[PDB]
Amino acid sequence: VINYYKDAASTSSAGQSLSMDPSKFTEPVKDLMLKGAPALN
Amino acid sequence: VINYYKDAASTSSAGQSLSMDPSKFTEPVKDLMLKGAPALN
Amino acid sequence: VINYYKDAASTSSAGQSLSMDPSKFTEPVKDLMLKGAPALN
Amino acid sequence: GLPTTTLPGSGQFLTTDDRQSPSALPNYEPTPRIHIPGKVHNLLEIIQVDTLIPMNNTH
Amino acid sequence: GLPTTTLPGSGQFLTTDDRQSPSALPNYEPTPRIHIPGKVHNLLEIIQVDTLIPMNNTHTKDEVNSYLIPLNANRQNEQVFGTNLFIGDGVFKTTLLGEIVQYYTHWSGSLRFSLMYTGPALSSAKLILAYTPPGARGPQDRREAMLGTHVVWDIGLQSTIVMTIPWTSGVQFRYTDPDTYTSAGFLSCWYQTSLILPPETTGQVYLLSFISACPDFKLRLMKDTQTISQT
Amino acid sequence: GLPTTTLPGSGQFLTTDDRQSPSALPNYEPTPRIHIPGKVHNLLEIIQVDTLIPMNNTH
Amino acid sequence: GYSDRVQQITLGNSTITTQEAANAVVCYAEWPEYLPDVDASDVNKTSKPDTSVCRFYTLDSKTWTTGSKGWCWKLPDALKDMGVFGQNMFFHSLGRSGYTVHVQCNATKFHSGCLLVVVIPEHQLASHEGGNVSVKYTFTHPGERGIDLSSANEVGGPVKDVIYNMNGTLLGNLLIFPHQFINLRTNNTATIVIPYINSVPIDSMTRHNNVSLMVIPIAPLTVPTGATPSLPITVTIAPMCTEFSGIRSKSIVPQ
Amino acid sequence: QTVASISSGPKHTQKVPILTANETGATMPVLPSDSIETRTTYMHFNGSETDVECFLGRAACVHVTEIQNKDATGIDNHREAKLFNDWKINLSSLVQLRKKLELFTYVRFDSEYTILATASQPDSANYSSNLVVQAMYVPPGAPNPKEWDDYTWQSASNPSVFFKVGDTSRFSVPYVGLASAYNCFYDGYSHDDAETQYGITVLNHMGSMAFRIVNEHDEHKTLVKIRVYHRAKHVEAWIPRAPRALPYTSIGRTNYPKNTEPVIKKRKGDIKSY
Amino acid sequence: QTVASISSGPKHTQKVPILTANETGATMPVLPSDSIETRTTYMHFNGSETDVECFLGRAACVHVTEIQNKDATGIDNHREAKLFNDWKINLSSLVQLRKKLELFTYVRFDSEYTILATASQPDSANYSSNLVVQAMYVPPGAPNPKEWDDYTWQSASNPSVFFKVGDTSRFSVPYVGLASAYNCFYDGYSHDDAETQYGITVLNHMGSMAFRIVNEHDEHKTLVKIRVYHRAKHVEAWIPRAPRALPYTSIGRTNYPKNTEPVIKKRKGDIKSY
Amino acid sequence: QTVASISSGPKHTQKVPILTANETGATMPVLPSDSIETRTTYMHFNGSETDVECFLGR
Ligand SMILES: COc1cc(CC(=O)c2ccc(C#N)cc2)c([N+](=O)[O-])cc1OC
Ligand SMILES: COc1cc(CC(=O)c2ccc(C#N)cc2)c([N+](=O)[O-])cc1OC
């Protein structure tokens, strides 16, 4: 992985992000909801 | 950045000068003028 | 400057000799002649 | 000159390859990143969000 | 022989690439450098120097008068001049700023607009310069103008007023080529009080306007200019 | 196979370039050098020797 | 107690004073200096007349009228007949010099007018004939009389539209060159110090003019009611750090 | 490494993980181990192929255009005769890549272009000419070519590429957006005007790519077709949205055809049919 | 890193930064924070793309010429028949690059040339010949070719490049000026003469580049057009000047056409019009 | 680095460097500083392009 070019845009693909946090989409609720506890208490 | 050729002219572009002093053009006055002080005192 | 070939003839140009002594042509006289002194004493 | 041998495939354009290439806009400085909510990194993140199924597709 | 695979693009000539190439004049020794004043390293250095704006480009042909902004005695609250802020066109197009700006696609930063009074020393005046950020129309009367960024200029011993046009935008870069989404707004000048001439004076009074960039300034994506051709 | 990209100029013959090239006579052993007086290294050496000027080139 | 307004300049046995200046400009922020060994090429030991050539020489005053277009002088040309400086110019093969230009113009607090005073390095003039016509030696060597931008064209001469700087560029951008303004309501004089600017260590002082000085009316002259409709403009120039090299017989130039 | 399912046995509690309330707007992370007895198993999977960098990271054709080499004598409009041609840069002309990009609202990345040029001689010709193509990028504000031989093709500042027909051109371009990211959608206008255009067509003024054939004409006519491919690299995406369902009708706008076939399949039988 | 604007609040002082005197010849570095209340912001910008090295650092076409391969039998003047051709090296023939260079007075740099040769067979031909071009540099003082087959093309000392038509030639040349820098302008003559030439045409005697086609003639005639591109590297510039406003008329001189359209746009309305 | 000409001033001696006898067959290395007043200057030149390796090297 030797960069032959001067600019960043020249480099190849970034490689896996390895972050993977779905909660900002699956659980965007204000009050935390614990699996197993009443959804509506 | 390995130079394959013997002469200097062969090498690629120089890269940013990083000097950037506009005053020799914007302020070529003999007596220093301080921003905020009377231009003509 | 990595030589890809086995023989010496394959290598590129030698580079400046850096010897530069013209006296064997300009002053091939037997008795040394000092600049400023009578050529014929 | 370094002796080389070109292999089969030379010249091909594989829409899937991932190599370097010269930049057509050298020294260009892209706009700064600012924070934007809702960043997605993997499609596996979003398929975990459920959507409605048109179960009664009898119309 | 080292096994290789040539990638697409091989053989192309990209006018923008920056690679090494053999020298056609090996061992040539270029002439020594000597000191020469006025070295320029970046175009951003020189656009900070202001040049005259041909604000009064109302003439039949190009002429010195195109740079003279007429000011009239005993006029009150009336408009002196106006212009939109497409720095890559209009009055700005021929100025050093406009000329250099046109060598690039994008721009950002603050502009330095100044006015120098040339009327007789014994005369007086108070003008008001105003920058109207994008979103509304160019002001039609002093009141409308005064509601936005402005400077009340008192003509006096110090001959020049320098009003800065602070970078006021949502998107952080505008196009040099006139584009509506990226419009910069309007610049106008009005009479705060009026121009007053002394006795025995009747000659016309003029203003000289200049334009330059602040260190704030940025230009991106080099391109060809519409200011030259042949074929 | 090492991915490469050929640049413009490839194939050209610049009479001035100075690269390596394969030897057509491998293992050949050239004749030994012997001493020879009057070796010249630079043309600037010899132009310092003066020669006659045909000043009266009126013939 | 001091001010940009009041200044004195002394070179040789000449001194100019002004009580209404607007600072002074030193081209590209560099004061003139002599040629250092490291940059020299010509092996001849140079001559430095010092005080006998580095002094103020005053040219004939021009007359600024309500219709003037402007004037253009060239250096060292403008001083070719000025005392010992001039003599040295023709007796030597080479030479280099810097200058202190002082343009004078006074009126009253009732007048109004604004002159642009600028120094342009390598001001290559254009032929009014267009195409590829040249500009004869004589016409770019007007001497101390300089070129009058409101005079008519002449065969072999340069174009003179003040608006295009005599070279195909717009007047308004002349400000990128070291300049100063003489705005009657503020100014009385303009002062510019010019260092040697060339791509060679030293040069011929007769076949090449290093810079040209232009005095251009931008805001036209206006005088109070019933006053003489003109004001004189005077140009005073003083060479500095002048070096002459390669002395021989006196040079003979076109006309 | 990672477990795909933990070992879970019988259950009898007041903790009911499978009873939720979807009106909260959340998708509770319920697992098989929450409703059935499971054994231990591992992932043996990272999901590298579904990373946005990979998803938009491959070349897709984004435009096809045509130019031709022929005698220019008499031709008044070179552009129309296709002595040279234009491409108002945009990525929503060909639907395949477009639908992918529009899976997100904002998108930021560098672009790697690959331009393929193929020759064709439909009429009688004695040989196949060896033509060289010149693709010049004309940023908004740069003078547009009017004739295949303008002074404009000098391309002193505009970047441009020269390559043989039949061969391929390749280079990358940094993220050129004016904002921090590109907009796939824009609920707005260029200004507050009653008639002005709506949509991202307002934001997408990226300029043109001018194509021409440098060679003078041969006795016959040669038709060169140009295909531009785009691959994104160093990808970032924000605000995922509902996938495109109906066919597209125009570059840049969300418009869909009047009278379109239903998108949802209709049961061949009941709502009880398998 | 660098701040674009500092935080500045209300103001009421005797220090008036926005009142200056432009007749001094200076452009006081006034900032927005000097006339309005500002917040803190950063540059996130270095200005690398506006460095003179970058500005003149890209290839621009500087010359187009033509040569042709055909029977030389009977041709008296080979040069005229274009059996071979010349190029009196200069960079002010094509205006795009010229205007850029002329943004400065003195300029110093190494040059990287790229020469493109394209074939064309306007008349009837059975095939496209595979021609080899020879570009030979003829420095002032070297013997000029008279026939496409002179002894001169031996090029024993002159440097020259051989390349196929359709392909491209590339090499760089060190800064060859005789002075410390090249002159973009020259207010002088070659000597003190009443009629001699004025301008840089006096300084620009860089020699010629002779082009020819090494192949003997084929049955048909082939027209090869040669395009030379120039890219500057290791750039240095001095004394910036006013940009070129009027069109050029000649190589090397500042002359402009008689009766030219005004350069400054004229208002469609008032001096008060927006 | 190397000096092209040393600084030399007025001269009045019995050491006459410019009087030689070319019949000896030698070319005495006379310099400008031997017959005129000179200033100091440097070579800024190595003469690499006139090396026989370069001369026959193309
Ligand atoms: C190869 O052709 C070029 C294409 C482009 C346009 C570009 O890269 C782009 C990509 C994605 C989006 C979105 N959404 C907007 C623009 C540019 N350019 O923009 O400068 C230059 C090209 O040749 C220098
Ligand atoms: C590739 O063609 C060649 C071009 C040149 C001329 C050159 O490089 C030059 C550049 C800029 C300016 C200015 N201003 C003056 C000259 C030289 N040359 O000068 O020796 C050789 C070439 O082939 C060995």
Swiss-Prot record, chains H, I:
Protein's cellular compartments: Virion; Host cytoplasm
Superkingdom: Viruses
Subunit record text: Interacts with capsid protein VP0, and capsid protein VP3 to form heterotrimeric protomers. Five protomers subsequently associate to form pentamers which serve as building blocks for the capsid. Interacts with capsid protein VP2, capsid protein VP3 and capsid protein VP4 following cleavage of capsid protein VP0. Interacts with host ICAM1.
Function: Forms an icosahedral capsid of pseudo T=3 symmetry with capsid proteins VP2 and VP3. The capsid is 300 Angstroms in diameter, composed of 60 copies of each capsid protein and enclosing the viral positive strand RNA genome. Capsid protein VP1 mainly forms the vertices of the capsid. Capsid protein VP1 interacts with host ICAM1 to provide virion attachment to target host cells. This attachment induces virion internalization. Tyrosine kinases are probably involved in the entry process. After binding to its receptor, the capsid undergoes conformational changes.
Protein name listed in UniProt: Capsid protein VP1
Organism expressing this protein natively: Human rhinovirus 14 (HRV-14)
Swiss-Prot record, chain J:
Subcellular location field: Virion; Host cytoplasm
Function: Forms an icosahedral capsid of pseudo T=3 symmetry with capsid proteins VP2 and VP3. The capsid is 300 Angstroms in diameter, composed of 60 copies of each capsid protein and enclosing the viral positive strand RNA genome. Capsid protein VP1 mainly forms the vertices of the capsid. Capsid protein VP1 interacts with host ICAM1 to provide virion attachment to target host cells. This attachment induces virion internalization. Tyrosine kinases are probably involved in the entry process. After binding to its receptor, the capsid undergoes conformational changes.
Subunit structure as annotated in this protein's UniProt entry: Interacts with capsid protein VP0, and capsid protein VP3 to form heterotrimeric protomers. Five protomers subsequently associate to form pentamers which serve as building blocks for the capsid. Interacts with capsid protein VP2, capsid protein VP3 and capsid protein VP4 following cleavage of capsid protein VP0. Interacts with host ICAM1.
Name recorded for this polypeptide: Capsid protein VP1
Residues represented out of the complete protein: 583 to 640 of 2179
